[PDB]
Every structure is written in C-alpha cells, then in structure tokens.
Design a protein around this ligand. Structure first.
Ligand code: 6CM
Length: 231
C-alpha cells in the first residue's frame, strides 16, 4: 500500500529512539507511579501550543507482547477499554495489519473538541535469532486522507503514538501465564492542533494516561486469562 514507507519510517523511529532511557534526563519528570507503572512527561510549549512528550513504562504479568499489541490494535475491542473517544471508525483498510482510523475525542471544557485521523499498524520485529523473543509494536500516527478533511466543528489534532512490547518467559511442563511478563513502553506525542489552556490540558493528561494504562493492561489480562497463550 501507499503508506508502506511511512510505516517503516515510524517503526524505525520508535525502535531507535523510544526505548532510550529518559530517567537520567533533567527535562523528563516522573509524574505518576503506581505498582510497575511509571509515567513520565517533558513539558514543551511552542507558540501557545502544548506538545508535552509523554512516555510510560509498565510490566504486566501473564500476557505476551503479541497479545497486548493485538488488543491495542484490534478495533473490535476498542470500546471495551478506550474511554476518551466519542466515536471512531475505520476510514480505510490498507493491509491485514494496517488501517486508517478517524475519531473524535470527548470534549474537555473549555477547549474545543478535537478530532484525529491516523494510520494504525501492528508489526513484529524479530530478534537476531530464534532463541530470543523480541518485539511487537503498534504505531498510531496522523496521516492525510481525502475522505476525512478538516472540518469547522473540531480542531484537528496530530499524533505520534507507539506501544512497544517485549516478552519475558521464565522441566518439560507446559508454559504457564504465571511465568510470563510483558514489558511495555508507551509513547505519545500529541499536537492538540491549536490553543488549549495549558494547566487544564496537563491535568487531563496526568489523569488520563495512567487511567488508560491501568485499564487497558488489566483488560488484556482479563481477556487472555485461561485462553491458550498466543506468543
Ligand atoms: C483542555 C484539553 C485540550 C485537549 C486537546 C488535546 C486533545 C488531543 C486528542 C488526541 C488524543 C489521541 C489519543 C491517542 C489515541 C490512540 O493512540 C489509541 C486508540 O484510541 N489510544 C491510546 O493511545 C490511549 C490514549 C490515552 C489518552 C489519555
């Protein structure tokens, strides 16, 4: 499909940069921590646009990266976990692993409602050799599409989001979910597409990103429990 190059650019970008440790960087703050979940933010505002890069890490017992990415990507289960959208639909299917989605986000007073139009792609990045697990990634990034032009009702946000998952598996007996741990890195770079009250936006992000990570990861745990493990 016509976006194959852009997909590879985004996958490469995230594998090169999004797994780099920000813990030693004075500009990055740990804003929320609960259990194995850590949410970081770097405050960035340019010409009255709040861009605050966000990065979170998590470690989720009993699920694989393939499972986590499938659930994050699969639109059929989206409404079971996502709480920040008013509506969404698939604009176009590009490939078995790549779709273009239009969605509107719930309005947060006093700001105008935002909409977003993004390519969502799920990819397996194999290890150097078969004895190593390596990574599953979902990239959600804004693209242009003639069927979803700008409208006068919503401010068009632009996003670059990735969920990156690595799976740790620890006799001749069957592997148990007790011995699997999924290490998650989640990054979100959102351009709100226009002005917003900075403190209101920042408070919403600080509330909603951890809420999402907790809800979504617990959802994957609930839905995979008892089911055969999809490595
Ligand atoms: C005063 C408020 C001003 C508001 C202005 C900013 C609004 C920007 C809306 C754009 C938000 C895009 C969120 C990304 C969504 C997708 O990748 C995905 C599936 O929906 N979900 C998450 O990554 C989970 C997303 C979790 C979000 C908390």
């Amino acid at each position: 499909h016509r976006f194959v190059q852009k997909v590879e650019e985004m996958v490469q970008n995230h594998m090169t940069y999004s797994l780099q440790d920000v813990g030693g960087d004075a500009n990055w703050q740990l804003v929320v921590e609960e259990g194995e979940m850590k949410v970081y933010r770097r405050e960035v505002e340019e010409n009255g646009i709040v861009l605050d890069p966000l990065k979170a890490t998590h470690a989720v017992k009993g699920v694989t990266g393939h499972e986590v990415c499938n659930y994050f990507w699969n639109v059929d289960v989206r409404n079971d976990w996502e709480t920040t959208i008013e509506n969404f639909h698939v604009v176009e299917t590009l490939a078995d692993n790549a779709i273009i989605i239009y969605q509107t986000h719930k309005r947060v007073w006093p700001a105008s409602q935002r909409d977003v139009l993004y390519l969502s792609v799920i990819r397996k990045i194999p290890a150097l050799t078969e004895n190593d697990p390596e990574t599953w990634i979902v990239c959600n990034f804004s693209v242009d599409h003639d069927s979803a032009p700008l409208n006068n009702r919503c401010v068009r946000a632009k996003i670059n989001v990735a969920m990156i998952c690595q799976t740790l598996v620890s006799g001749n007996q069957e592997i148990s979910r007790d011995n699997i741990l999924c290490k998650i890195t989640y990054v979100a770079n959102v351009n709100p597409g226009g002005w917003a009250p900075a403190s209101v936006l920042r408070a919403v992000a600080k509330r909603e990103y951890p809420k999402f990570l907790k809800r979504f990861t617990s959802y994957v745990q609930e839905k995979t429990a008892g089911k055969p493990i999809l490595f």
